[PDB]
Amino acid sequence: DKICLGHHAVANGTIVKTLTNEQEEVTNATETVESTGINRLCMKGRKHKDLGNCHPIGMLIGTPACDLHLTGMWDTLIERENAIAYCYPGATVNVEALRQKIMESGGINKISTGFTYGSSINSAGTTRACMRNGGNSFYAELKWLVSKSKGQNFPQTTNTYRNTDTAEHLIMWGIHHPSSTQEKNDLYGTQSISISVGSSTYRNNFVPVVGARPQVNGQSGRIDFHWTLVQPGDNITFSHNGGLIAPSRVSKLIGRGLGIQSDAPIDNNCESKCFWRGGSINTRLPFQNLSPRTVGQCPKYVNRRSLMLATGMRNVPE
Amino acid sequence: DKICLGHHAVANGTIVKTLTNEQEEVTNATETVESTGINRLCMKGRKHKDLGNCHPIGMLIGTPACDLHLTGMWDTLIERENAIAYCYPGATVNVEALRQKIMESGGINKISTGFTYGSSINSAGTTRACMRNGGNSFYAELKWLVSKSKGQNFPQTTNTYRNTDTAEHLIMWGIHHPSSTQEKNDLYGTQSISISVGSSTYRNNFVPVVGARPQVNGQSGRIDFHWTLVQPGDNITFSHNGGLIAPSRVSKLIGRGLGIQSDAPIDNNCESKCFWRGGSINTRLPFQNLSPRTVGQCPKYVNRRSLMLATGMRNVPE
Amino acid sequence: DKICLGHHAVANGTIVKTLTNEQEEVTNATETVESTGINRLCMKGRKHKDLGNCHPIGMLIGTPACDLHLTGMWDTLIERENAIAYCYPGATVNVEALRQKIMESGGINKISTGFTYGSSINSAGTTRACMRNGGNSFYAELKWLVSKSKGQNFPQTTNTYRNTDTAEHLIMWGIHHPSSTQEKNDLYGTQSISISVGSSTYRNNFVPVVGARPQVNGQSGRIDFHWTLVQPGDNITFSHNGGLIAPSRVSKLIGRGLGIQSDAPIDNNCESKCFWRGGSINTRLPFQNLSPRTVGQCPKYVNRRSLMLATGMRNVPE
Amino acid sequence: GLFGAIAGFLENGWEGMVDGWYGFRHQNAQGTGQAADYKSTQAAIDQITGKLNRLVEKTNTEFESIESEFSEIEHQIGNVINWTKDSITDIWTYQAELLVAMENQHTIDMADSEMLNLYERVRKQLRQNAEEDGKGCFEIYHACDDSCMESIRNNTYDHSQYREEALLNRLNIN
Amino acid sequence: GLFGAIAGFLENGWEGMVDGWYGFRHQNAQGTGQAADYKSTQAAIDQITGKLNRLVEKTNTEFESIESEFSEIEHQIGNVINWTKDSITDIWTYQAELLVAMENQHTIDMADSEMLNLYERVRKQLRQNAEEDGKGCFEIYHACDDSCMESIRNNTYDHSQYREEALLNRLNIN
Amino acid sequence: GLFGAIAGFLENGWEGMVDGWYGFRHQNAQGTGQAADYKSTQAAIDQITGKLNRLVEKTNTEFESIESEFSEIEHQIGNVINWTKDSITDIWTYQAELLVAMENQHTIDMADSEMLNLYERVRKQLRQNAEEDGKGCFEIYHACDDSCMESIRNNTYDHSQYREEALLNRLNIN
Ligand SMILES: *[C@@H]1O[C@H](CO)[C@@H](O[C@@H]2O[C@H](CO)[C@@H](O)[C@H](O)[C@H]2NC(C)=O)[C@H](O)[C@H]1NC(C)=O
């Protein structure tokens, strides 16, 4: 008469790693690395703004593509591929710093500068590069200033924006760089051209420069955009005689939001805290191998397909 | 007759975490994360310099607030909040890289440029923004060059600093940007203005720009500061005709030191090797949850209030 | 009668660290930190390029020291110390971005701009600083454009490079900065000089500046280098009237390669995958303490001389 | 193994035991039987469940993007970011690999431990009334009906009831 | 746990034993007694002391600041610093969490191991003169006065001295 | 250690045994012998080899340089790079130190475990024919000549062949 002690075994064992063995066989195991993502933007429970073909910079200068995104509130901003920032060709200085400021904001308010111009200034410069309602237009937050009379010298003019708020404001302006000495003379006169910007914390000078260059959207002219933050209670003064693309509105970035860059479709029926170019990730799991570029609260990225965690004893089959 | 084996227990058991259990009662335990700092800068054993209301950049140009910190040797440098670097309104190009050099040095030596100016030049330009001894002054290591005869063209001058030392030298100069054309013409004349700085490894050009801006410390004119390193054996040439704020002395950063940004009062009686904005951290523990911004040799920051290390066996009471 | 169980010991034990013991003695241990490197660049198995005294940037513009290296293919690229980029004294804007770009490529192709000039323009500028075969010369991929009529105005000219390839191209140009108003007038004329470069994505402007500077290679003049990427199908236009050092050839970086900065001799007989300033590293070991600066596939740098891994039981001798 | 039971002095596992992780097989005059042990099995399962909960706990740290997906990053700052992120990825896959490896060693060893702890429990139950067979079995030196076998599994077996008979049986004297 | 003793076959700990971590309780004609074991207590304590020393050994790396507290940081590089620091911080809290959980597991197991090593030491001293409770007690099959109990705790007890009397009592024969 | 054998109830190791990690010494009327046990030695040796395989496996990840050896780094970006690299170095030296300490602890403990497993398999082989002396020895209560000693080591000892004689010598009676 004998009584025996024993443990279970299974037919189909799983293979895990240990400190001493790379091919240890146990009764059961479970994955620690997430390999499956959701190819949709799970927006349930969050006020989001999908910018479609509007680039975040365009929200500040007011490109036609961004006409529905000039102001608003959100807790997550969605940028899409090939979004448009410029209708009239150009470039923003320190654009990546500026784009990131917007992408971590939670809303934009717009406030008027209040700028007025003398009788020798045409403040409604316009272009076929910024079409709006079947008619030539311009950036909605900026004003292309041109001599009212063709060929005539642009008047030395001064404009000062006061920040009377309790928060800092984002101010953008442009400088027009004409494609020909001809074009420059027609718009601003034959005089020497200079733009001077000064606040209590910022000062800089710009000069429109004539240059031949290829056509972009029908235009060989350029506008280079610049920006600064005006602190509350501070004034910022514009001193110019042609070439300034003046602001009619400044921006105030409100609160905090999550910036997502993806071309995945929005799904308002699922929740997620983790996003990337391909969509969302939702796991209990601590690691993932979907992408090293994520945003939000994500599992840590690892260079492994799989890392099995044993959940049973050594398998000794028979 | 019998003998029984056993282990101790305690009435006040603590809870710790193990690999398998989140709530394991043991006999004793000890914390591994420091939660307690000292709200003072423990400077015992260290030759230190409290800059007070003197800003590190001020040490180089010689702002009145930094009159006692123009030269020196230290192994720890203490910067305070709202420290003053500019008496006359201006900015420095690449100020953060420059501020960091100062904050990791063990001292400053000053050497004269040996710059001389003719009779047509008034090198003793002065301002009420930089008051010193109840009278208008200027940065102690700089000089505001100006036409001695009010309204006349500043002469075409050339100054050269020769580094004959065995180490590199920090040279700073300023460019004056007048608030108006009348002011400019007054100081430097009507001529076109250009400042050209050139060494063997450095060349740059500067043009003072007239512009309207708000008043700061009563002045609407600005002084933009610039700098470079002059290598030993090398000479650097200043070529100018008005608008140059010239260096009378040059800086040599000596050795190495610990830079501390803090508003905590100095205590020469306690000793430390870890500092943050709120003071010192004195711990044998490997982790701390005070600040993720520390300097010196510190416990690693963790996002945890408490991590108990079991120092006794499982507690099985009664 | 008795049978006894036991284990081996050795007289000369080895000391290792455990979770509880800092001085635990065991029968055998092995090192986990590699302390020994090879004093040579092990280039076996790799199609390498040793630049010698040719600096990576010299390859693009065509410094005489780089005549053997103007094009090529490689999977690894070796830069030496005190290498030569500039024969005529000057500097490149964004030099380190450009060098890194070259040092992670697998080859360079050179393609002609096909720039042609008027008879009024002498396009064969020459200098004593760029000696090529006992006779004055210039950068092989750049042309120093000069007025053929000494003292007469350089004509307003326009050159356009058209990228007809399916890949981006690297274009470099220079700006001459004369050391005297005399020299400036002799070479380009008495007119206001201006260079404007423009493409679909890039636009910039340059103005030759006259300044007093020390002599480098005898020259007190300077040449500043600038560069960009020209996208497929895009044209880039040079609008200039003097002082433009124009590109006769354009660069094209092919694929990927490893960039090494070492003054260590080349050994074509040993293999390696990890390199540093002092040579190569060939280990199975996971950690090293030779250098925190390595390139390639390397063991992780640790701050320890030795970390012994026990390979035997406790040593209990007698 | 560390405790020398599972994959040790125990020849193999029992595929027919799906009622638990640890168990008894007996043999007497009435025939054979098999039963799982709940206590020892739950000790092993609870510890594994505790490991899984620790694997599932999550950090609150939000991260913003520092690489534009849709626009060019300046080359030098791009290489630094590339270097940093790759350095950080290496730490994590190292950590994960270490995590799993260290955990699996401990799980395998503690399962062995629970098997040994049960065995030891039985050995001391029977005390002088049985002898170890060397392969996980106890040879019982008195008749043990299913009711008696149940008492051993149930931890109610009284050794004093069978001691006198068992001793005579072991010393081979009657 | 791992070794079956503490929170295992020993029902509970002893609050009365303020003398040491491990010890003896005895029962004879003179009554009851209690004593701590020095060697086994020191083995556990020395090991804990060792963990604390490794915990407290300090690395020598001095760090400069890369974030101004009192002036602005350029936005793009500031975001990189933020991303980096937050990543390094996540790594350290993970490591601190893992270190503590793992050390705690080992500290609890080794303490249980010292208990078991003392129990086994005593089991071997007595060999054939005593039998196991199953509860951490040895039933001694001869008379053991206070001196005899002391010889057991102090590891001097000769089993051959009491063997004859003991074997008679165990086999229940005169 | 954890398992009470090595630096435990065995006083010391044998320097004379260069044949293997674990083994036997014996005494009988015909003299003395020494022999290594191959199974227990290979068990320990295989686990060591596995540790060294996992240690050496290469997980890279090619890095480019972000620090020029031969030209200047802009100051701010260079401090950010230095900060990052030292932070990463601090993590790696921590992990390497912990890796080695934890692995070493495990190595010496499993080695102690394999010793104990051998001693345990011998105890069960001899069952009622031998008794433990407390120092890692089995005092055999019958004549065990050189071939009997060999059968114990080779795991071919049949306890039923010697039981009667041995029980006789242990009880002294019958
Ligand atoms: C509980 O454990 C702590 C540490 O784990 C013990 O405190 C230490 O006591 C020693 C003296 O033996 C001192 O040298 C240390 O400085 C103490 N460390 C700390 C952090 O306090 C404490 O004594 C233990 N308590 C009991 C009742 O044993």
Ligand SMILES: *[C@@H]1O[C@H](CO)[C@@H](O)[C@H](O)[C@H]1NC(C)=O
């Ligand atoms: C802004 O302008 C107003 C009106 O000119 C003035 O009262 C105020 O002081 C200015 N603020 C600053 C900071 O200059």
Ligand SMILES: *[C@@H]1O[C@H](CO)[C@@H](O)[C@H](O)[C@H]1NC(C)=O
């Ligand atoms: C109570 O227990 C704590 C551990 O939590 C210990 O540090 C303290 O000394 C104990 N005090 C008493 C009076 O038992």
Ligand SMILES: *[C@@H]1O[C@H](CO)[C@@H](O)[C@H](O)[C@H]1NC(C)=O
């Ligand atoms: C600097 O000037 C001195 C004297 O004028 C001269 O001896 C020296 O060689 C010069 N150095 C350089 C680098 O031009």
Ligand SMILES: *[C@@H]1O[C@H](CO)[C@@H](O)[C@H](O)[C@H]1NC(C)=O
């Ligand atoms: C480049 O120039 C060619 C020749 O005129 C022209 O056909 C082509 O469209 C130009 N490309 C761009 C992008 O302007």
Ligand SMILES: *[C@@H]1O[C@H](CO)[C@@H](O)[C@H](O)[C@H]1NC(C)=O
């Ligand atoms: C950074 O890494 C990505 C992914 O491999 C690569 O596409 C990109 O070119 C890298 N950036 C730089 C500047 O090397």
Ligand SMILES: *[C@@H]1O[C@H](CO)[C@@H](O)[C@H](O)[C@H]1NC(C)=O
């Ligand atoms: C970096 O983090 C700090 C602390 O959360 C925050 O105040 C700062 O604004 C952040 N910087 C950027 C550029 O997001």
Ligand SMILES: *[C@@H]1O[C@H](CO)[C@@H](O)[C@H](O)[C@H]1NC(C)=O
């Ligand atoms: C970076 O570290 C190296 C090595 O200690 C040092 O030489 C260098 O000066 C550091 N860079 C900065 C900007 O401090």
